[PDB]
Amino acid sequence: FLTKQEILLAHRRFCELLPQEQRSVESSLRAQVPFEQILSLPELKANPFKERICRVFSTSPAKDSLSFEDFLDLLSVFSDTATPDIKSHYAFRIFDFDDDGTLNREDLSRLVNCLTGEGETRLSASEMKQLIDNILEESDIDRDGTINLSEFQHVISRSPDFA
């Protein structure tokens, strides 16, 4: 998903986030950049899900930092060459706020809140209930109250190309 120019450019940008003492190639490939530095990058700073994006691409058990390889994975998924299948798969992981494998009413509520902003312009209790009910009506095929991956990939594939 990334060209060689993109990988080499990514390494130079990644290294600018490290202390001077960790900028050798070997040190840089062992380094873990905390989210605070990642969340300020132009590619992420304006993204409403930046905090969820960091978490999903982190490979450390504490899910609180990004390695260079994790950072290449993030760029790979957000590149213009990434397939519709991979984008909807990672979108599902990003929207799964509690990380339990399905999108429930709480996940959908947090997703809507991300789209509007924390609050003023926040949706009211009634507006949120009506929106979530409508989302579930279109997406939850087996009617068990949650949206699993296949339901999600199916609903996305039937939507216009967000290109």
């Binding site: 899900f49 929106l131 279109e138």
Partner: peptide, 12 residues
């Protein structure tokens, strides 16, 4: 379509 808007917010 709600999902179009949410994917555009994420990948746009």
């Amino acid at each position: 379509s709600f999902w179009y808007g949410a994917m555009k917010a994420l990948y746009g």
